[PDB]
């Protein structure tokens, strides 16, 4: 047999339905979601770190001039400053005053903790859904493999084959352009690889992080020695990787909508909770058993001893029944007002059982099936005094949960004595229009 | 080793998280909803402070120095009662829907 329905995309809540194979007793079934992963397509165009400017020796030809070429090197700089006229230890350089030459050039390279912490610069690409499930039905123990979140592939778990189908939303947390630094990923945009303003993010550019093509700009401009000493001096700004290590902002697994929780190998944004998933799930039909042999219900009468408000299971109900003979059957509320905490129950001739269950209704009106037969149950409950817990809801609240039945009342007597107001207006209205003709023939 | 923050005192009101907090170094409270919009709040605690979250019945999580994230979800206690006089329905229903009852009237 096939089943089809659809369920929420939410992780800790079992989906409880109850196939129904005319002819054959009834299968309870439990799906249950333990992970969803919305994994996008990423590609990795650079990475950057703090930088490390090294300064070779400077030539001191100190009779005469030197000039330089061109070498390829990112951020190269040359300069010659004249007439220096240095003093080392034991004397001074040379003999040659007022006119010298110091070359002192500089070269800006990549840093040894680029290894170890750097930044990588993702282009992100709207990639595949999948998620784990648990699920058991019958007889059959809890068997567990995870499926692919689109409405095609179908996955073996146990002997049943489950297509999960498309999620009803298209929203993904993660923007166009992600920085992956360390354990947590951002929301930043990118130069480009082209450019870099030298202060903010594109100082330092590297394709990998082995690579050999570097990109750098960080203004490094040279500075003439003074009072006659051998040493190259330069200024240039600092580093944006730094700079942005002090004013990055909060990271995305801290501002994500929709409790996502954020993690990285694949760059995955886990246990979001948007929208609904539809099943569509193929039980064998060796998992059905002919209703000759199952326990048949009648005369059914439910009572609600106990009610409470809170989404917690506090919420009592007894039946009677009279079964036709012992066994196990299942029991299941299909309404929406009610969850119900028992998968099946044990069964007499002429006994009485007790489920627990969890509404959010004031007044539930909801009604179960127990061995393809069903009774509506009916009572009032009281709200809790707890005021804050640390467990998510296991009902879901509707639009009419909170009306009562005082509250009923005073709209029926609003609505009810409006519109008989209107219509007497109307009626007397209609009355006259009668009595005035009929004055005349 | 990093240093572990001492554990704040938690109180619970209608719809309300109270954290007396009592640190020794500056330390991180960032906290978020579990909505469909995050509201997220961010701030460095150096002297004793108290701050008031105020926590729907969608969620909310807060991170305090470096321990684990801890979520709390808010149910729907109230304050009045739904069956009684007039003047009582119509409070209990204010304290639990406060805008619709407003335009609902």
Do not use: A, I, L, V
């Given at each position: 047999y096939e089943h089809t329905a659809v369920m929420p995309n939410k992780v800790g809540i079992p989906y409880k339905a109850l196939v129904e194979r005319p002819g054959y007793a009834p299968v309870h079934l439990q799906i249950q979601l333990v992970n969803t992963r919305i994994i996008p397509s990423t590609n990795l165009e650079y990475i950057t770190c703090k930088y490390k400017t090294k300064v070779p020796s400077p030539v001191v030809k100190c009779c005469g001039a030197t000039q330089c070429t061109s070498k390829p090197h990112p951020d190269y700089q040359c300069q010659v400053f004249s007439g220096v006229y240095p003093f080392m230890w034991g004397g001074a350089y040379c003999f040659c005053d007022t006119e010298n030459t110091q070359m002192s050039e500089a070269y800006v390279e990549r840093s040894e903790e680029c290894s170890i912490d750097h930044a990588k610069a993702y282009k992100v690409h709207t990639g595949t859904v999948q998620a784990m499930v648990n699920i058991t039905y019958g007889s059959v123990s809890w068997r567990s493999a995870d499926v692919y979140v689109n409405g095609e592939t179908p996955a073996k778990i146990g002997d049943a084959k489950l297509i999960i189908g498309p999620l009803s939303s298209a929203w993904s947390?993660?923007?166009?352009k992600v920085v992956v630094y360390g354990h947590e990923v951002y929301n930043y945009d990118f130069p480009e690889y082209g450019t870099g303003k030298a202060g903010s993010f594109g100082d330092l550019q590297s394709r990998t992080s082995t690579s050999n093509d570097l990109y750098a700009n960080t203004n490094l401009k040279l500075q003439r020695p003074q009072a006659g000493i051998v040493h190259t001096p330069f200024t240039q700004v600092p580093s944006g990787f730094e700079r942005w290590k002090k004013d990055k902002g909060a990271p995305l697994n801290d501002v994500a909508p929709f409790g996502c929780s954020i993690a990285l190998e694949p760059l995955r944004a886990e246990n979001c909770a948007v929208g609904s998933i539809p099943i569509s799930i193929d039980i064998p039909d060796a998992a059905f058993t002919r209703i000759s042999e199952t326990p048949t219900v009648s005369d059914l009468e439910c009572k609600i001893t106990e009610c409470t408000y809170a989404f917690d299971f506090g919420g009592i109900a007894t039946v009677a029944y009279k079964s036709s003979k012992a066994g196990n059957c299942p029991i299941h509320s299909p309404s929406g007002v009610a969850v119900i905490k028992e998968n099946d129950v044990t069964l007499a001739e002429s006994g009485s059982f007790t489920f627990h269950f969890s509404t959010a209704n004031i007044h539930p009106a909801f009604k179960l099936q127990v061995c393809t037969s069903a009774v509506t149950c009916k009572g009032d409950c009281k709200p809790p005094k707890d005021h804050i817990v640390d467990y998510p809801a296991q009902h879901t609240e509707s639009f009419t949960s909170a009306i009562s039945a005082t509250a009923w009342s005073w709209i029926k007597v609003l609505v009810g004595g409006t519109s008989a107001f209107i219509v007497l207006g109307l009626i007397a209205t209609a009355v006259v229009a009668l009595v005035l003709f009929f004055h005349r023939h | 080793i990093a240093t572990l923050a001492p554990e704040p005192l938690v109180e619970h009101k209608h719809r309300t998280l109270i954290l007396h907090l009592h640190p020794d170094h500056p330390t991180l409270l960032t906290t978020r909803s579990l909505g469909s919009d995050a509201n997220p709040t961010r701030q460095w605690i150096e002297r004793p402070t108290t701050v008031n979250f105020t926590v729907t019945g969608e969620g909310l999580e807060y991170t305090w120095g470096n321990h684990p994230p801890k979520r709390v979800w808010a149910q729907?206690?109230?304050?009045?009662?739904?069956?009684?006089?007039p003047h009582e329905v119509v409070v209990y229903y204010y304290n639990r829907y406060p805008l619709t009852t407003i335009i609902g009237l």
């Open positions: 947390p993660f923007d166009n | 729907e206690s109230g304050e009045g009662n739904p069956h009684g006089w």
